[PDB]
Ligand SMILES: *C(=O)CCCCCCC
């Protein structure tokens with residue numbers, strides 16, 4: 001999250017308190033199809049990877 | 062001397078006169094805006110980082126380097142041999158008589174070498190520099206100079222380097238250990254500085270003396 | 273000596289002048305972006 | 310004037326999260342810490358003593 | 368001596384200049400990938 | 405100037421999780437720690453003393 | 463320069479789980495710890511003293 005914020009233009013000081021609740025770290029997996037052309041779309045699977053309770057209404061960045 | 066005219070460090074006029082604003086145009090409005098110099102798009106939530114030529118940026122000089130080395134070696138050797146026939150029996154007098162076989166010898170050797178070296182330096186302060194070029198990958202070349210004159214002489218603190226924008230903190234400041242081609246300089250003039258150069262004769266001897 | 277002219281470690285000019293931005297194109301927009309690298 | 314020069318080869322997967330690497334993880338490390346001025350000149354041996362240190366019998 | 372020119376341990380230039388990236392191809396994409404080794 | 409040189413043969417299954425091996429697990433270990441300059445010259449024996457150390461009777 | 467040389471014969475069922483054997487389980491153990499340089503030369507006896515140590519009457 002700090003990497004993303006820094007990339008966007010906001011530098012959070014280091015060694016500071018930060019406890020979020022609406023964010024989860026996920027692994028995304030997909031299947032590259034045959035003869036795939038750039039611009040097309042595929043379906044992805046999103047899976048939690050640490051101590052999260054649910055991904056009910058989330059959005060993948 | 063103190064009567065020889067010298068120019069001050071801060072030259073020119075040290076005051077400015079306010080200029081009267083323009084006469085308001087007689088539309089139906091009370092709000093009158095003097096000609097506003099339009100500056101470009103400015104983000105709202107992003108930190109105030111320098112982005113173009115001429116922007117300022119604070120450097121926090123904190124340098125602390127310290128290196129050292131040493132070594133040694135040694136060696137030693139002793140030896141001491143002896144032999145003495147005090148009372149020789151008669152039947153042996155033809156071989157060990159008249160002290161013809163007594164012997165005594167000694168020997169020694171020693172060596173000790175050693176050496177070492179070290180170096181160190183520190184630096185602490187704060188200095189605001191200015192961007193003078195934007196590189197092809199977003200890095201900023203920065204240069205800066207601060208001149209002080211406390212009652213007798215003049216000290217100069219100059220700085221130059223290259224900064225990566227993603228290292229600038231939220232308060233528009235970078236520690237000097239994150240600058241790539243750091244050139245720092247802290248010099249002075251006046252007789253206080255002249256009292257710290259070696260005399261030409263001593264400087265010559267320091268280089269050409271045999272020892 | 274201290275009177276012999278030597279060059280400083282940081283050479284060249286130690287200041288820069290800001291350059292005026294481009295004149296905004298007269299589309300219907302307030303957002304004007306100078307040529308972005 | 311003091312000069313600190315460095316040269317080496319770095320493996321990207323060793324760079325920390327704050328864009329920093331300890332110098333013990335660099336392969337062909339060349340480090341140099343030298344100086345000039347009369348402070349540095351006061352630490353070279355005299356040519357006669359340097360000659361004796363090499364050619365003296367003991 | 369201290370005036371005899373010696374070469375430093377770290378030789379050559381101790382700085383590098385960033386090179387401008389390639390011009391993006393005008394497909395319908397924002398993602399442009401420079402030639403990846 | 406000090407030089408630390410190393411050469412050897414490593415078995416991959418001995419490399420730790422942090423890409424590191426203790427030097428006691430290298431087979432043909434050649435380690436070298438030498439230097440130059442007058443600090444190193446002040447630690448060689450004089451040629452006469454070196455000759456005596458070998459050819460003296462005692 | 464110091465040299466540590468080793469030679470021997472090992473029975474595989476004595477190798478531990480970490481690929482290590484204590485040297486007391488090797489059959490024809492030949493161990494050698496020698497050196498060279500003047501530090502080693504300062505530990506040989508002089509030829510005259512060596513001669514006397516063998517041929518002196520007492
Ligand atoms: C101030 O007026 C000092 C100038 C004196 C310099 C020359 C003295 C002979």
Ligand SMILES: *C(=O)CCCCCCC
Pocket residue numbers: 261273274275276
């Ligand atoms: C500064 O002006 C010192 C120059 C003196 C060098 C030569 C002295 C005879």
Ligand SMILES: *C(=O)CCCCCCC
Pocket residue numbers: 268269356368369370371
């Ligand atoms: C530095 O310039 C020292 C050179 C002196 C070497 C020869 C002295 C007679």
